Amino acid sequence: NLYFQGSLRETSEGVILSVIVAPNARETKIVGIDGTRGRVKVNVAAPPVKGKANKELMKFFKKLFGAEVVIVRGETSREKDLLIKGITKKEVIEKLEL
Ligand code: NA
Numbered sequence: 444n445l446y447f448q449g450s451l452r453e454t455s456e457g458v459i460l461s462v463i464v465a466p467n468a469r470e471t472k473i474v475g476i477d478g479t480r481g482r483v484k485v486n487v488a489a490p491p492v493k494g495k496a497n498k499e500l501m502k503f504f505k506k507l508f509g510a511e512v513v514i515v516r517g518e519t520s521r522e523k524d525l526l527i528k529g530i531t532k533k534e535v536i537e538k539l540e541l
């Protein structure tokens with residue numbers, strides 16, 4: 444039921460996945476799509492302090508995609524853009540739709 448196409452774009456370097464983080468969660472997980480922002484809603488099991496939400500977010504998606512993931516926008520924001528290097532949009536969508 445979730446459509447990720449409005450939260451992704453494929454660039455020269457890989458795929459930029461646009462997310463909005465909800466911290467203080469009991470489990471890091473994808474919960475839905477913010478259609479007004481074009482972002483994947485991700486609960487993150489970390490407080491919003493010490494870059495701890497960034498660390499958990501990148502661990503989660505590196506494991507999911509099997510590729511390196513860096514934060515390219517929003518290091519100190521809830522609205523973060525994640526560059527997944529060396530991957531196609533088709534691959535990213537397949538992993539998100541699991
Ligand atoms: Na590009």
Ligand code: NA
Binds near residue numbers: 502504507
């Ligand atoms: Na994962």
